[PDB]
Design a protein around this ligand. Structure first.
Ligand SMILES: Nc1ncnc2c1ncn2[C@@H]1O[C@H](COP(=O)(O)OP(=O)(O)OP(=O)(O)O)[C@@H](O)[C@H]1O
Ligand SMILES: *C(=O)CCCC[C@@H]1SC[C@@H]2NC(=O)N[C@@H]21
Ligand SMILES: [Mg+2]
Lengths: 673, 248, 222
């Protein structure tokens, strides 16, 4: 971080989200003017405000805003930007972008083009790697044209079969085939889907490694032929073939095999003449055998975690390399310093298919920056909007420590002290993963989520002690609210005679069980009797702060009160999971037995229009099954656009509401089963 | 030579004639009188005292305000005539009306308002809304203190139709008076129905089904005569008992 | 709940283009103490929102427009719903907070035949008669006499504020500056400071006394 060295004066970050914020931060920290591009929707995002100047580039969709080649080119033209930084995704690995940038004097901060089209395609990358004397997954080189050829290949490449669409990526077009019939039908369906997904229409058949570990090697190279490998990364916890939880040092690896993998990655990088930061991904089996699989010729999403152990700012190194300066670190200089673990906080519901994207606006957002050893990379601020146009990822949370246990404990504390209200996130899944016994022990594969939760994610299965603690905390909170309700100001006309109730006897309904609780208050200390068990809860009892810190029997806990109703309903986020409880007094509980249960499920197979209007836009297509709280269509009425949500989970039979069709109140909008 | 006297005479003659002989004549072919003629018919002969006749925005400011006597009892009146000029209930118009209500509430005498928006530009400056708000505040303040009577003698539209509603009694003139917030053209633009002005806000609509107006009279002279007769019933203020007259 | 808590969520809650709507209940929840709000008539005349909340521990009555429902336009039902709530809050010394996004009155022949004039006058009377402290915040729109309806400065509105997206005009001068230069709004505040500002005002106006002429009772346009 020496400003004396001459460096590019203007850098334009052609990206959005947390990566743009990170690039802007590291450019500001070395004294470089920054330009950030944005769409019309992201006119008030964090990265736009962090930059020195910004220019709108087009409409909401990314196909016309962050992929509008010309618009970015003239955006550079007005601001006379000296360098361009693509981050990851979007235009990071586009050859036409690199060529168009090279047409002018402005330099593209990234790998050279030749490497980009060398590693862009999978078959040629595998052939080069085999020529680069590095281990590769067993298989047949070339493109298989017919299913009979696929089964003939499977005859010798082993019974397990892995079919993968050429090029593309993002966890698409990858399937498992077991039998010959499975091989042929999977090949046929993948060939059919290749045109729809990528259009390359090329497939690869390989040997599927059982219980693999997706290890990653970060490589940094300059234009002088110097290549360095910076430790490793383990990326095993994945759903839909997408990384979720990563660790900087790999607990499986040892010094010798780490050195071997680093040397192989450096040799492969030299064989391609890489001149930036990249990643080489290996699939290490149980027998410490690593096979090369794909090379990302761009900055990695999980790059910050390996910055914690090494202590190096990767983006600064890429900028310096682009300037032309040589590398200031040698292979011996690289060493591991502690442990680091990071997690991806998405805006998705973890209870459906291990995560289903959600939308909404953030009514509350707070990060645990004050906690020890916590770093948050987020392009989100309170009041931000999670739309359907971009990746619904909210943040990246990084925790480092002296060893793995300290890092994991800090990660759990940070997850407990992290506030998101407005959308549905996956913090519960993250906490359950980091506190799982197998993860702590270190035995994890790429099918961790599949076999640990066969049926699916259900939440934190809380034990007897934890259940007693939760019931005690909920009862104490209820009694605290009741006590606060009695604190009025002096009236001097009708003085308030505070009731002298000593013991609150309560009925608490959790899941499908009813518990009897006896709570007593002694100032800031509550004594709770839960079915014979005696608990002692002490706290400051601040009923307005989003985060509440309590001490139950000495054990420190952090809880959140998401919801609270006068009818006794309460939602408590405890140990990362949201639990619904119903607290009543004993008299109210006894009298509740005479209340007849009211059926309200009904059918609701027809969605009557709530307000009269004329439909002008239709967000979905008929026959597309949707869940609750999802966009349907846009109705224009009296110069007002109104958007509704789907009513029932049932499959959409037909979207009756269509553009140009007037739909008055009480008319069917979307037919449901 | 001093031009002050001739300037004063010219100002008085312009205020009396208003917009000219052509404008009063055009008002006459519509079967309606002017503000000053209505005031002369309503009040006792030789009892009207006008206020702020020299205040300009053009003298008069399209409203005639003053005090008079009906059968010997004091009353405060204002009369609107926007056909001559102005076309805006924004500037000194609202100030004059507010001041006349202030005098009435200070003394403790009823207020009679002859509403005739006529040809008024509803697309004028923001001063119109402020004046309307001030007038509404004064009507609410005077409610229950002094009686307030409104006589709609012409087409009243926009936000000005809330001042008559806040008064105690509202009267209309058949075939020449209207009360509506939104014009028929905007109604057709929004609701998409063909409605004429008379059946949207006419006297019959507001006296038979709307329940806004209290009575409808044949024409201006009949309306003013009935207004005098009705005013003879009420007390001058809530501080006074119900009037007692000679009985036979 | 600190009285100076910032609410940065309100900075971008109002869409730039006037053709889009938003939820006023979100603003109300963001501003009030503990995000707790007891709504009155939540399922009737949904184009206006009335309810009880607390600011700095003091009970306040809240009235606002709902641009989601009928573009926030005022009609007979909403006028009657708001008027009685305002009258009750005034009768029992409960301060009033208003959020204004009204584009006008709902046009049509049904509204005229139902007596929209009388019920609009009810709302005007309810806002003008109140002698309790009242604080008004204009979020986006205030058109025509409707702006006069919801406690303009000229109806003895104690303090009036406007967000940078507020726009006051007679008909559909596209900025609040004509209102600011003429004293129609005390200040143009940032949306994130709203709550804080309101609290300060409620601390000042707690000792407000006004004097009005004697009467047995006035004449509501009932
Ligand atoms: N041949 C294979 N054998 C076993 N597992 C595999 C195989 N190919 C892919 N996988 C699994 O699928 C994941 C996806 O790997 P890969 O890098 O090919 O995906 P991608 O969608 O192209 O990635 P990216 O977004 O980084 O370009 C791997 O991490 C691994 O868990
Ligand atoms: C298009 O149909 C024209 C819209 C005019 C209605 C708007 S909104 C409500 C206000 N009341 C009125 O008469 N015009 C304004
Ligand atoms: Mg990959």
């Amino acid at each position: 971080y020496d400003p004396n060295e001459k460096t590019f004066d203007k850098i334009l970050v052609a990206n959005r989200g947390e990566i743009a914020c990170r690039v802007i931060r590291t450019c500001k920290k070395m004294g470089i003017k920054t330009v950030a591009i944005h769409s019309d929707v992201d006119a008030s995002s964090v990265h736009v405000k962090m930059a020195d100047e910004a220019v709108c580039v087009g409409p909401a969709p990314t196909s016309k805003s962050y992929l509008n080649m010309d618009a970015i080119m003239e955006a550079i033209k007005k601001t006379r930007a000296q360098a361009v930084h693509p981050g990851y995704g979007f235009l990071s690995e586009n050859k036409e972008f690199a060529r168009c940038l090279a047409a002018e004097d402005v330099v593209f901060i990234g790998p050279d083009t030749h490497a980009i089209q060398a590693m862009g395609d999978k078959i040629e990358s595998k052939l080069l790697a085999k020529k680069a004397e590095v281990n590769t997954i067993p298989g047949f080189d070339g493109v298989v044209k017919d299913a009979e050829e696929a089964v003939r290949i499977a005859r010798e490449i082993g019974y397990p079969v892995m079919i993968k669409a050429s090029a593309g990526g993002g966890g698409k077009g990858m399937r498992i085939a077991w039998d010959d019939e499975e091989t042929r039908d999977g090949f046929r369906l993948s060939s059919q889907e290749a045109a729809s997904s990528f259009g390359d229409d090329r497939l690869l058949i390989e040997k599927f490694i059982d219980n693999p570990r997706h290890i990653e090697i970060q490589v940094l190279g300059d234009k002088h032929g110097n290549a360095l490998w910076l430790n490793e990364r383990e990326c095993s916890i994945q759903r839909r073939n997408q990384k979720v939880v990563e660790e900087a040092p790999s607990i499986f690896l040892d010094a010798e095999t780490r050195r071997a993998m680093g040397e192989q990655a450096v040799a492969l990088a030299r064989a391609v003449k890489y001149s930036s930061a990249g990643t080489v991904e290996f699939l290490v089996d149980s027998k410490k055998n690593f096979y090369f699989l794909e090379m990302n010729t761009r900055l990695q999403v999980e790059h910050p975690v390996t910055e914690c152990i090494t202590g190096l700012d990767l983006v600064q190194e890429m900028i310096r390399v682009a300037k032309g300066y040589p590398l200031r670190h040698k292979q011996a200089d690289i060493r591991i310093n502690g442990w680091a673990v990071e997690c991806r906080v998405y805006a998705e519901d973890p209870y459906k298919s291990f995560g289903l994207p959600s939308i909404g606006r953030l009514s509350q957002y707070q990060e645990p920056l004050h906690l020890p050893g916590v770093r948050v990379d987020s392009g989100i601020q309170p009041g931000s909007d999670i739309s359907i146009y971009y990746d619904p990822m909210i943040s990246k949370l990084i925790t480092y420590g002296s060893d793995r246990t300290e890092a994991l404990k800090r990660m759990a504390d940070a997850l407990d002290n992290y506030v998101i209200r407005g959308v549905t996130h996956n913090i519960a899944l993250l906490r359950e993963v980091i506190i799982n016994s197998r993860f702590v022990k270190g035995d994890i594969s790429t099918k961790f989520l599949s076999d640990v939760y066969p049926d699916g994610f259900k939440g934190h299965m809380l034990t007897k002690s934890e259940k007693n603690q939760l019931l005690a905390i909920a009862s104490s909170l209820f009694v605290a609210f009741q006590l606060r309700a009695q604190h009025f100001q002096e009236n001097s006309r009708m003085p308030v005679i505070k009731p002298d109730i000593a013991n609150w006897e309560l009925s608490v309904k959790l899941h499908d069980k009813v518990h009897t609780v006896v709570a007593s208050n002694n100032g800031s200390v509550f004594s709770v009797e839960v079915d014979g068990s005696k608990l002692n809860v002490t706290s400051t009892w601040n009923l307005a702060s989003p985060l509440l810190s309590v001490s139950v029997d000495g054990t420190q806990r952090t809880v959140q009160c998401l919801s609270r109703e006068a009818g006794g309903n309460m939602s408590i986020q405890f140990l990362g999971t949201v639990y619904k409880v119903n607290i009543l007094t004993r008299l109210a509980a006894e009298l509740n037995k005479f209340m007849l249960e009211k059926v309200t499920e009904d059918t609701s197979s027809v969605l009557r229009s709530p307000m009269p209007g004329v439909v002008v836009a239709v967000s979905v297509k008929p026959g597309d099954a949707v869940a609750e709280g999802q966009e349907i269509c846009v109705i224009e009425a009296m110069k007002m656009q109104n958007s509704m949500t789907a009513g029932k989970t049932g499959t959409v039979k037909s979207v009756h509401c269509q553009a140009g069709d007037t739909v008055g109140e009480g008319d069917l909008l979307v037919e449901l089963e | 030579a001093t031009s002050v006297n001739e300037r004063i005479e010219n100002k008085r003659r312009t205020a009396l004639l208003g917009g000219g002989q052509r404008r009063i004549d055009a008002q006459h072919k519509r079967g309606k009188l002017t503000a000053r003629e209505r005031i002369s018919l309503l009040l006792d002969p030789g009892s009207f005292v006008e206020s702020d006749m020299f205040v300009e925005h053009f003298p008069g400011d399209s409203v005639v305000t003053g005090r008079g006597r009906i059968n010997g009892r004091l009353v405060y009146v204002f009369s609107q005539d926007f056909t001559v000029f102005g076309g805006s209930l924004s500037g000194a118009h609202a100030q004059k009306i507010c001041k006349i209500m202030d005098q009435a509430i200070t003394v403790g005498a009823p207020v009679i308002g002859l509403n005739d928006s006529g040809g008024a530009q509803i697309q004028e400056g923001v001063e119109s809304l402020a004046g309307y708000a001030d007038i509404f505040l004064r009507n609410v303040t005077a409610s229950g203190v002094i009686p307030q009577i409104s006589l709609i003698m012409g087409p009243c539209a926009g936000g000005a139709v809330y001042s008559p509603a806040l008064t105690d009694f509202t009267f209309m003139v058949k075939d020449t008076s209207y009360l509506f917030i939104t014009g028929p053209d905007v109604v057709k633009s929004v609701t998409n129905e063909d409605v004429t002005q008379e059946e949207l806000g006419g006297a019959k609509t507001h006296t038979t089904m709307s329940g806004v107006a209290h009575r409808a009279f044949e024409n201006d002279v009949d309306a003013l005569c009935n207004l005098r007769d009705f005013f003879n019933y009420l007390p001058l203020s809530s501080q006074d008992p119900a009037p007692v007259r000679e009985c036979h | 709940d600190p009285s100076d808590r910032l609410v940065p969520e309100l900075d971008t809650i109002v869409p730039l283009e006037s053709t889009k709507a938003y939820n006023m209940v979100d603003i109300i929840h963001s501003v009030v103490d503990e995000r707790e709000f007891f709504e009155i008539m939540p399922n009737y005349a949904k184009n206006i929102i009335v309810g009880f909340a607390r600011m700095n521990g003091r009970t306040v009555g809240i009235v606002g427009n709902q641009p989601k429902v009928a573009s926030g336009c005022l009609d007979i039902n909403s006028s009657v719903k708001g008027a009685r709530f305002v009258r009750f809050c005034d009768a029992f010394n409960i301060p009033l907070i208003t959020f204004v996004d009204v584009p006008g009155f709902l046009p049509g022949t049904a509204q005229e035949y139902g007596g929209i004039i009388r019920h609009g006058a009810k709302l005007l009377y309810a806002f003008a008669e109140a002698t309790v402290p009242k604080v008004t915040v204009i979020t986006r729109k205030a058109y025509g006499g409707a702006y006069d309806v919801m406690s303009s400065k000229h109806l003895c509105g104690d303090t009036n504020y406007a967000w940078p997206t507020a726009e006051i005009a007679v008909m559909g001068f596209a900025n609040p500056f004509p209102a600011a230069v003429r004293g129609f709004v005390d200040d143009i505040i940032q949306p994130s400071s709203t709550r804080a500002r309101i609290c300060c005002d409620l601390d000042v106006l707690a000792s407000k006394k006004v004097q009005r002429p004697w009467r047995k009772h006035a004449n509501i346009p009932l």
